[PDB]
Amino acid sequence: MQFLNMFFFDIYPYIAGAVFLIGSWLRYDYGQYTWRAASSQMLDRKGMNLASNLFHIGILGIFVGHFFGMLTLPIEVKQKMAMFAGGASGVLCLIGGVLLLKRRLFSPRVRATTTGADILILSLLVIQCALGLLTIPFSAQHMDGSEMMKLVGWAQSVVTFHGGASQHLDGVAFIFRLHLVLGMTLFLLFPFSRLIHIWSVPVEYLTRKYQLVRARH
Amino acid sequence: SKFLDRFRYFKQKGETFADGHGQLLNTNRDWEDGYRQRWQHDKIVRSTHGVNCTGSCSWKIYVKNGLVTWETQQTDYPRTRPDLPNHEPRGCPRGASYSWYLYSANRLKYPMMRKRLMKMWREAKALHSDPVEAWASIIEDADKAKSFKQARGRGGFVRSSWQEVNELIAASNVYTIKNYGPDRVAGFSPIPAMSMVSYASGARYLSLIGGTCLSFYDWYCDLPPASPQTWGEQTDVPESADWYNSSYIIAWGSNVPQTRTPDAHFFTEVRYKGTKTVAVTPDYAEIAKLCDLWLAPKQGTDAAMALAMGHVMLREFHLDNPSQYFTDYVRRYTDMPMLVMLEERDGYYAAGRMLRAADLVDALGQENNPEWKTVAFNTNGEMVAPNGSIGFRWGEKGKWNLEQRDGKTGEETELQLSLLGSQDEIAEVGFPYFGGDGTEHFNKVELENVLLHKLPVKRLQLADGSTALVTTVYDLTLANYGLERGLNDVNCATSYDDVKAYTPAWAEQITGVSRSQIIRIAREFADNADKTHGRSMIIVGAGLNHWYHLDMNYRGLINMLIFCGCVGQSGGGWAHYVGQEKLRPQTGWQPLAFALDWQRPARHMNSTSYFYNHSSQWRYETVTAEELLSPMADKSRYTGHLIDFNVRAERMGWLPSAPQLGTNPLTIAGEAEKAGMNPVDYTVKSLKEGSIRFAAEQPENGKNHPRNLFIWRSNLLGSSGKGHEFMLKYLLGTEHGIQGKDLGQQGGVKPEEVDWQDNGLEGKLDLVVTLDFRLSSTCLYSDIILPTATWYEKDDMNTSDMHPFIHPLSAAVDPAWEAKSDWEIYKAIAKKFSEVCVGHLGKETDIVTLPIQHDSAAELAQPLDVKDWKKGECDLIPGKTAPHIMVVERDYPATYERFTSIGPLMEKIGNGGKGIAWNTQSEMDLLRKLNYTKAEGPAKGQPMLNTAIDAAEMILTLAPETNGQVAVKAWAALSEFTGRDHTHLALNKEDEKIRFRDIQAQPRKIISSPTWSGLEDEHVSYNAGYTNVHELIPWRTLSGRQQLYQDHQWMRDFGESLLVYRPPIDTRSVKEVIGQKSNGNQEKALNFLTPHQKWGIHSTYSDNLLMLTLGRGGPVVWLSEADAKDLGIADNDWIEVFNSNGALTARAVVSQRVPAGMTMMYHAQERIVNLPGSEITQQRGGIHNSVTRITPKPTHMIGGYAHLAYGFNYYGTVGSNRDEFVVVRKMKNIDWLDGEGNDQVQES
Amino acid sequence: MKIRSQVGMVLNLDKCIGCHTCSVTAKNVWTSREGVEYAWFNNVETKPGQGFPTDWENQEKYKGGWIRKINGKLQPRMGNRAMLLGKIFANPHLPGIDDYYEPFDFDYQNLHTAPEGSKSQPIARPRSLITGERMAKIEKGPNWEDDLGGEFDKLAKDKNFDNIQKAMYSQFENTFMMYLPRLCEHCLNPACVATCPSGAIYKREEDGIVLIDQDKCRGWRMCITGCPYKKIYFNWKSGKSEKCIFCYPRIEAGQPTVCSETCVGRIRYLGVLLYDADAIERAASTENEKDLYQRQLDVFLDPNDPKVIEQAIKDGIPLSVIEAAQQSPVYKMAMEWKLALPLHPEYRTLPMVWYVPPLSPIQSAADAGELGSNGILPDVESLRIPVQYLANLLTAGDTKPVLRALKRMLAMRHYKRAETVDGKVDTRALEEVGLTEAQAQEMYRYLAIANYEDRFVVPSSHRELAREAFPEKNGCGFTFGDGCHGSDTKFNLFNSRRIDAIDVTSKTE
Ligand SMILES: Nc1nc2c(c(=O)[nH]1)N[C@@H](/C(S)=C(/S)[C@H](O)COP(=O)(O)OP(=O)(O)OC[C@H]1O[C@@H](n3cnc4c(=O)[nH]c(N)nc43)[C@H](O)[C@@H]1O)C=N2
Ligand SMILES: Oc1c(Cl)c(Cl)c(Cl)c(Cl)c1Cl
Ligand code: SF4
Ligand code: SF4
Ligand SMILES: [Mo+6]
Tell me the helices (H) and strands (E) count for chain A, helix number first. 11, 1
Chain C positions touching B514 (Cβ under 8 A) are: 367-368
Domain definitions of chain A by residue range: 2-208
| CA pair distance B365, B391, nearest whole angstrom | 13
| CA pair distance B53, B144, nearest whole angstrom | 42
Region(s) of chain B under CATH 2.40.40.20: 1047-1237
Surface-to-core class of residue A8, CB atoms within 10 Å of its CB (0-12 exposed, 13-18 middle, 19+ buried): middle
Give the helix/strand (H/E) hosting C349.
none
Testing the interface with C: which of A27, A32, A107 to mutate, by most C Cβ within 10 A? Answer: A32
CB distance B25–A213 less than 8 Å?
yes
At residue B1146, the 3 state secondary structure works out as strand
| CA pair distance B736, B1179, nearest whole angstrom | 8
| CA pair distance B1205, B1197, nearest whole angstrom | 9
Q: Which of residues 18-37 of B touch A (CB under 8 A)?
A: 18, 20-29, 31
Give the neighbor-by-neighbor strand order of the sheet with C210-212. B13-17, B22-25, A211-214, C201-204, C210-212
Assess whether C194 and C276 both reside in one domain.
no
| CA pair distance B122, B117, nearest whole angstrom | 9
Q: Which of residues 82-111 of A touch C (CB under 8 A)?
A: 108-109
Q: Which atom of ligand 4 is nearest to the CA of C44?
A: 5
Assess whether C45 and C84 both reside in one domain.
yes
* Amino acid at residue number B408: K
At residue C316, the 3 state secondary structure works out as coil
CB distance C240–A56 less than 8 Å?
no
Looking at the complex, report in whole angstroms how far the Cα of residue C92 sits from the nearest Cα belonging to chain A.
7
- Percent composition of chain A: helix, strand, coil (DSSP 3-state, to 5): 75, 0, 20
CB distance B23–A211 less than 8 Å?
yes
Residue C502 located in a structural domain: no
The residue whose CA is least distant from atom 1 of ligand 4 is C263
| CA pair distance C106, C138, nearest whole angstrom | 11
Selecting from B22, B26, B27 the residue whose C-beta is nearest the C-beta of A209 gives B22
Domain boundary among C435, C452, C487: C435
The residue whose CA is least distant from atom 1 of ligand 3 is B95
CB distance B25–A211 less than 8 Å?
no
Q: Does A209 reach chain C within 8 Å, measured CB to CB?
A: no
CB distance C85–A30 less than 8 Å?
no
Residue C168 located in a structural domain: yes
| CA pair distance A149, A171, nearest whole angstrom | 12
Assess whether C333 and C377 both reside in one domain.
no
DSSP codes joined into one string, B108-165: --S-EEEHHHHHHHHHHHTT-SSHHHHHHHHHT-HHHHHHHHTTTTSS-EEE--HHHH
| CA pair distance A109, A104, nearest whole angstrom | 9
Give the neighbor-by-neighbor strand order of the sheet with B793-798. B793-798, B805-811, B1004-1005
Residue C496 located in a structural domain: no
Chain A positions touching B17 (Cβ under 8 A) are: 211, 213
At residue B549, the 3 state secondary structure works out as coil
Which domain does C415 fall in, by range?
Answer: 359-435
Whether A186 lines ligand 2, by a CB cut-off of 6 Å, is: no
Give the neighbor-by-neighbor strand order of the sheet with B248-252. B293-295, B276-280, B248-252, B536-540, B573-576
Phi then psi dihedrals of residue B707, to 5 deg: -120, -30
Please say whether the structural domain A2-208 has been given the CATH code 3.40.640.10: no
Tell me the helices (H) and strands (E) count for chain B, helix number first. 38, 40
Q: What is the 3-state secondary structure (H, E, C) of B213-259?
A: EECCCCCCCCCCCHHHHHHCCCCCCCCHHHHCCCCEEEEECCCHHHH
Surface-to-core class of residue B1241, CB atoms within 10 Å of its CB (0-12 exposed, 13-18 middle, 19+ buried): exposed
Number of compact structural domains in chain C: 3
Looking at the complex, report in whole angstroms how far the Cα of residue C374 sits from the nearest Cα belonging to chain B.
10
Looking at the complex, report in whole angstroms how far the Cα of residue C304 sits from the nearest Cα belonging to chain B.
24
Nearest CA in chain A to C349: A211
Ligand 1 surroundings by CB, under 6 angstroms = B 52-54, 222, 252-255, 258-259, 280-283, 285, 297, 299-300, 302, 541-544, 546, 578-579, 1089, 1091-1094, 1097-1098, 1163
B874 among the known binding-site residues? no
At residue B387, the 3 state secondary structure works out as coil
At residue C399, the 3 state secondary structure works out as helix
Q: What are the residues whose beta carbons fall under 8 Å from the beta carbon of C64, sequence distance 6 or more?
A: C56, C77, C78, C191, C225, C226, C227, C228, C229, C230, C347
| CA pair distance B759, B761, nearest whole angstrom | 7
Whether A189 lines ligand 2, by a CB cut-off of 6 Å, is: no
Strands (E), B436-508: 450-461, 467-472
B931 closest CA partner among B906, B911, B958, B951: B951
B1047-1237 CATH, one of 2.40.10.10, 2.40.40.20, 3.40.50.1980, 3.40.309.10: 2.40.40.20
Looking at the complex, report in whole angstroms how far the Cα of residue A200 sits from the nearest Cα belonging to chain B.
12
Contact by Cβ (8 Å): C3, C317: yes
Cα(B313) to centroid(ligand 3), Å: 39
Q: Which of residues 112-171 of A touch C (CB under 8 A)?
A: 112-113
Cα(B1098) to centroid(ligand 5), Å: 8
CB distance B3–A32 less than 8 Å?
no
Q: Look up the CATH number of the domain holding residue C392.
A: 1.10.3650.10
Assess whether C111 and C192 both reside in one domain.
yes
Q: Does B1114 reach chain C within 8 Å, measured CB to CB?
A: yes
Cα(B235) to centroid(ligand 5), Å: 13
At residue C443, the 3 state secondary structure works out as helix
Domain boundary among C203, C221, C244: C244
| CA pair distance B1185, B1142, nearest whole angstrom | 8
Assess whether C6 and C37 both reside in one domain.
no
Whether A69 lines ligand 2, by a CB cut-off of 6 Å, is: yes
CB distance C198–A202 less than 8 Å?
yes
Residue C509 located in a structural domain: no
Chain A positions touching C97 (Cβ under 8 A) are: 42-43, 109
Residue C49 located in a structural domain: yes
Residues forming a β-bridge with B276: B248
> Count of CB atoms within 10 A of residue B637's CB?
10
Contact by Cβ (8 Å): B1197, B1211: no
Selecting from C91, C215, C217 the residue whose C-beta is nearest the C-beta of A41 gives C91
| CA pair distance C239, B1063, nearest whole angstrom | 62
Nearest CA in chain C to A28: C215
Assess whether C375 and C443 both reside in one domain.
no
| CA pair distance B210, C341, nearest whole angstrom | 66
Give how far Cα B917 sits from Cα of B394, B593, B912, Å: 14, 18, 4
Contact by Cβ (8 Å): C350, C188: yes
Chain C positions touching A55 (Cβ under 8 A) are: 89
Chain C positions touching B1097 (Cβ under 8 A) are: none
Give how far Cα C232 sits from Cα of B81, B397, C43, C246, C344, Å: 43, 74, 12, 13, 17
| CA pair distance B958, B593, nearest whole angstrom | 13
Q: Look up the CATH number of the domain holding residue C457.
A: 3.30.70.20
Task: Report the CATH fold assignment for B107-218+585-789+818-897.
Answer: Rossmann fold (3.40.50)
DSSP codes joined into one string, B701-756: SSSSS--EEEEES--TTTTT-SSHHHIIIIII-S-----S--TTTTT-PPPSSS--
| CA pair distance B271, B248, nearest whole angstrom | 9
Assess whether C109 and C148 both reside in one domain.
yes
Q: What are the residues whose beta carbons fall under 8 Å from the beta carbon of A22, sequence distance 6 or more?
A: none
Ligand in nearest proximity to the CA of B578: 1
Strands (E), C263-397: 268-276, 300-301, 341-342, 353-356
Cα(A95) to centroid(ligand 2), Å: 20
> Count of CB atoms within 10 A of residue C406's CB?
24
Assess whether C59 and C114 both reside in one domain.
yes
Contact by Cβ (8 Å): B204, B593: yes
The residue whose CA is least distant from atom 4 of ligand 1 is B259
| CA pair distance B612, B218, nearest whole angstrom | 13
| CA pair distance B273, C421, nearest whole angstrom | 9
CA A99 to chain centre: 18
Give how far Cα B72 sits from Cα of B36, B538, B575, B795, C253, Å: 17, 32, 29, 19, 17
| CA pair distance B1112, C347, nearest whole angstrom | 32
Testing the interface with B: which of C2, C3, C15, C24 to mutate, by most B Cβ within 10 A? Answer: C24
Q: Does B1091 reach chain C within 8 Å, measured CB to CB?
A: no
Residue C488 located in a structural domain: no
Resolution in Å equals: 2.0
Looking at the complex, report in whole angstroms how far the Cα of residue C189 sits from the nearest Cα belonging to chain B.
9
Whether B87 lines ligand 3, by a CB cut-off of 6 Å, is: no
Assess whether C314 and C462 both reside in one domain.
yes
| CA pair distance B1223, C167, nearest whole angstrom | 31
At residue B798, the 3 state secondary structure works out as strand
Residue C249 located in a structural domain: yes
DSSP codes joined into one string, B316-350: IIIIIS--HHHHHHHHHHBSTTSEEEEEE-SSSEE
Q: Which of A66, A91, A158, when mutated, tests ligand 2's pocket best, judged by the most ligand atoms within 8 Å of its CB?
A: A66
CB distance A210–C277 less than 8 Å?
no
| CA pair distance C266, C402, nearest whole angstrom | 22
Cα(B90) to centroid(ligand 4), Å: 11
Give the helix/strand (H/E) hosting B604.
strand B604-605
Structure-solving method: X-ray
| CA pair distance A92, A88, nearest whole angstrom | 6
Residue C472 located in a structural domain: no
CB distance B265–C15 less than 8 Å?
yes
Phi then psi dihedrals of residue B389, to 5 deg: -70, 155
At residue B878, the 3 state secondary structure works out as strand
> Count of CB atoms within 10 A of residue B634's CB?
9
| CA pair distance B225, B1193, nearest whole angstrom | 11
